[PDB]
């Protein structure tokens, strides 16, 4: 928000800004005051910026009839998109107390000589007139005082979810009623051939690992229910499964330690010092066709229908299990193998999807020498960071948070966890210049599982790391536990007002955010308070740019928006130029319509609003809007067309939908930009 001023006497137009990007869905009581020396701007009652450069009145009284007042736009068509509720203009400057009094009284105000105009939109034509070529804006019904208690808690500067808030994690520390014994169901995916004779992990390994897992969590009121699921498929069993090996670097000539195997061709010959078993470095289908030799022996083609290496995400796509009712554990051999595969955090979009779970090493699962490295992979799946995240995993010393002091909002976000660097030896490590802000660490948590220590020196969790464990099993993992106890109210009720006889109090909704009873096989897990269905994109499709009728399926543009930096270009978004092969030049999108993304929603509803999280835009564009067109699909086939909208990097695009009498099951976003990055979509009913 900005407030610019330039009087007739002055020579320089001066602007006043705000302190934060504006909220695209919240009511703001904007107040601009000017007395003659200082101009002030109030956003929601707090003074944000004040400048004292403009002096005197804004015009001479001789040119009083020449000045005009415009609402919602200017003569150069600087149009406004949004709601205006109670217009008010005063002939005198009011201080902050009168601003808060006019906020708290709303528009029910009497007539005053200082009160120039106080307009509530019941008769626009009595005081306002539209443009003679334009049209008047539509009058609707809305309530500015809809809530008297803010139910939204902002996560901290280096937090990710609701329970990373300071006053919610402390409620799971002081209280003892939130740490009841909880049973969590989980599964182990065992691959077999078509004869039931060879496992990926032996049965005694699973039997030892289950008891060792329940032994380390029985003191923390956590029990695990094991349900081993066996899948018999010789196509998946005989081939190599890798987790940390990316598929782009297989085609790239840049070497990487995650992809170095005899069943990967040693990154296609791009890692060997020397640059058929040796003439297969990327024989054009001679060594990959099954009629000549076996496919798993000497085939490393990245675009072959059958190959030797298989990523864990494609294995999850093939299996397509259920993650809402169980925790899925997969296995993958990797060349790095210092850790296991990358676990899925509870704040990811893949927390309950079939692509989410824990990826482990099958040659270390159940072994007595490496039993505890599954437990650490449990802690990555339950919302616990590494202990050295505030020291070792710091990309720059000017970070928003760096754990130099124990706090609930910095580094590991646990007060009991002392700061520590990345160490492998047990005990307190030696001093070094690697740390950017400390030299001497005492009482380092070497006994915690989150360090990279060995099996013997990792024994127990700190008691501040069990509050997050008992919080994320109520926040994200409510469907895993078979207990019918609902999520409790994680915050104390707040006193709003009182009188001589009564006291009014309100409290927050329960911590999982559900406003209805948890009924399976329905849409009740997406409804909000007031019979409002808010849903994301379930299915997404886009045509291939280098193929006539490709129609590849994007995946990162479906779920809830998950971008750490909303203006830096990231990998969790859909791009027109990300659909190509890395060894192929991306083509330009066509002129009259551009490349489009087709998103599909699970429940077809009559829409009320559509929000799109456009993350990254190019610095320059031809048209004024980056998104060229938005077409709402229909069950009757009537494509409702909407023109271009100007998107911003940080603030998501929000569109209000009028007169849509047909149910919309999906949208199409037509753009001409090559590097536009759409992250998510939301259809508010």
């Amino acid at each position: 928000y900005f407030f610019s001023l330039k009087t007739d006497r002055a020579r320089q137009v001066t602007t006043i800004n705000a302190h934060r990007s504006y909220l695209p869905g919240q009511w703001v009581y904007l107040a601009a005051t000017y007395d003659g020396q200082f101009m002030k701007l109030y956003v929601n009652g707090a003074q944000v910026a004040t400048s004292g450069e403009q002096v005197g009145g804004i015009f001479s009284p001789l040119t009083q009839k020449c000045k005009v007042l415009m609402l919602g736009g200017s003569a150069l068509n600087h149009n406004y998109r949004g709601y205006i509720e109670h217009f008010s203009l005063w002939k005198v400057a009011r201080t902050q107390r009168e601003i808060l009094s006019d906020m708290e009284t709303h528009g029910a105000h009497t007539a005053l000589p200082q009160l120039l105009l106080q307009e509530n939109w019941d008769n626009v034509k009595h005081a306002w007139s539209p443009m003679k070529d334009g049209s008047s804006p539509k009058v609707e019904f809305s309530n500015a005082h809809g809530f008297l208690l803010d139910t939204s808690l902002e996560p901290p500067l280096c937090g990710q979810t609701l329970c990373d808030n300071t006053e919610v994690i402390a409620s799971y520390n002081q209280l003892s009623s939130f740490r009841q014994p909880k049973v969590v169901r989980y599964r182990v995916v065992n691959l077999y051939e078509d004869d039931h004779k060879n496992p990926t992990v032996t049965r005694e390994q699973v039997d030892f690992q289950h008891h060792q897992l329940a032994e380390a969590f029985k003191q923390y009121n956590i029990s695990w229910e094991l349900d081993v699921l066996e899948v018999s498929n010789s196509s998946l069993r005989r081939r190599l499964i890798l987790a940390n090996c990316d598929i782009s670097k297989i085609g790239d000539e840049n070497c990487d330690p995650e992809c170095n195997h005899t069943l990967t061709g040693h990154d296609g010959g791009d890692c060997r010092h020397l640059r058929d078993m040796d003439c297969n470095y990327e024989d054009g289908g001679e060594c990959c066709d099954p009629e000549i030799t076996n496919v798993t022996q000497t085939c490393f083609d990245p675009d072959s229908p059958h190959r030797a290496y298989l990523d864990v995400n494609e294995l999850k796509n093939i299996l397509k299990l259920d993650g809402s009712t169980h925790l899925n554990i997969f296995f993958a051999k990797s060349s790095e193998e210092e850790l296991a595969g990358v676990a899925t955090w509870p704040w990811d979009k893949e927390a309950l999807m079939h692509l989410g779970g824990i990826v482990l090493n099958p040659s270390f699962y159940g072994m007595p020498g490496h039993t505890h490295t599954m437990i650490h992979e449990i802690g990555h799946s339950l919302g616990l960071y590494h202990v050295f995240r505030g020291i070792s995993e710091i990309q720059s010393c000017s970070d928003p948070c760096m754990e130099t002091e124990p706090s609930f909002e910095t580094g590991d976000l646990c007060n009991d966890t002392n700061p520590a660097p990345k160490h492998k030896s047990c005990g307190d490590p030696g001093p070094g210049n690697d740390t950017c802000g400390f030299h001497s660490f005492f009482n380092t948590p070497y006994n915690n599982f989150m360090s990279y220590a060995d099996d013997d020196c990792t024994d127990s969790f700190t008691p501040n790391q069990v509050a997050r464990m008992h919080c994320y099993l109520d926040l994200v993992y409510q469907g895993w536990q078979p207990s019918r106890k609902p999520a409790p109210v994680a915050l104390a009720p707040q006193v709003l007002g009182h009188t001589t006889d009564s006291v009014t109090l309100e409290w927050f909704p329960p911590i999982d955010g559900h406003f209805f009873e948890r009924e399976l096989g329905s849409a009740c897990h997406l409804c909000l308070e007031g019979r409002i269905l808010v849903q994301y994109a379930s299915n997404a499709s886009s045509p291939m740019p280098c193929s006539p009728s490709g129609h590849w399926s994007p995946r990162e543009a479906e779920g809830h928006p998950d971008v750490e930096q909303p203006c830096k270009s990231s990998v969790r978004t859909w791009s027109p130029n990300s659909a190509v092969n890395p060894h192929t030049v991306p083509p330009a999108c066509p002129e009259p319509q551009g490349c489009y993304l087709e998103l599909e929603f699970l429940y077809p509803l009559v829409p009320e609003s559509l929000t799109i999280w456009v993350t990254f835009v190019s610095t320059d564009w031809d048209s004024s809007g980056a998104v060229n067109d938005i077409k709402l699909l229909a069950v009757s086939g009537k494509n409702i067309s909407l023109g271009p909208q100007n998107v911003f990097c940080d603030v998501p695009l929000t569109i209000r939908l009028w007169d849509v009498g047909e149910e919309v099951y999906g949208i199409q976003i037509y753009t001409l930009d090559e590097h536009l990055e759409i992250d998510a979509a939301m259809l508010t009913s």
Binding site: A46, T50, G52, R97, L100
Partner: protein, 212 residues
């Protein structure tokens, strides 16, 4: 970044406000001036003399602590505003004569108390970047002393984030110390505007009066 000053607790935003408080000195360097460290002491220039002095821009603007309220200028095209009342840029030589002739401008600011130099603070209202010309410009921070020529410190480029640019005085302890007296700042681009130069010294000890 807020502060409330009433019994019903009305609050205000203090970073962009023009009034410095007691608590704001250690946090907001952009409103309370340059934060002097606890072991040092800053001294600002007095009797500052310039080269291209004119009626539009005189040379007494460098005296005293400059106002930190002046924001950085991002690709400034013209300087026809009232910037000379709180800063100094050359006004006799315009843009094309400076760009073609490749002349030089200097600011030979004096000081009052003769102390040793630990760092030289130069506070500018702009980086000198032009709207068309995207080439960076590098200024030189010289140093002058009593009954001797100079002790050069090098050159530095302009950064908006570091508007109070700090020049670490490079000195060997095998060489005997010197009492700094004046600071000369030289630049060839016309868009460099200097709001104020300074000199950081020791409030604990003076190493000249003892090593006579």
């Amino acid at each position: 970044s807020f502060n409330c000053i009433d019994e019903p607790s009305r609050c205000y935003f203090h970073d962009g406000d023009g009034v410095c408080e007691e608590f704001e000195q250690k946090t907001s360097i952009k409103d309370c001036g340059v934060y002097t460290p606890q072991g040092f002491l800053d001294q600002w220039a007095s009797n500052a003399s310039v080269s291209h002095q004119d009626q539009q821009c005189p040379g007494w603007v460098i005296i005293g602590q400059p106002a930190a309220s002046q924001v950085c200028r991002t690709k400034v095209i013209d300087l026809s505003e009232g910037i000379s009342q709180h800063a100094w840029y050359p006004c006799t030589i315009s843009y094309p004569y400076s760009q073609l002739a490749q002349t030089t401008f200097w600011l030979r600011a004096y000081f009052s108390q003769p102390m040793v130099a630990a760092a030289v603070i130069v506070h500018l209202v702009t980086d000198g970047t032009y709207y068309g010309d995207q080439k960076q410009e590098t200024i030189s921070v010289q140093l002058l002393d009593t009954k001797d020529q100079s002790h050069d410190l090098g050159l530095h480029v302009l950064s908006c984030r570091n508007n109070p640019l700090i020049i670490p005085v490079v000195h060997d302890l095998s060489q005997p110390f010197y009492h700094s007296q004046a600071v000369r700042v030289s630049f060839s681009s016309p868009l460099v505007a200097i709001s104020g130069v300074a000199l950081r010294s020791f409030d604990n000890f003076d190493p000249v009066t003892l090593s006579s």
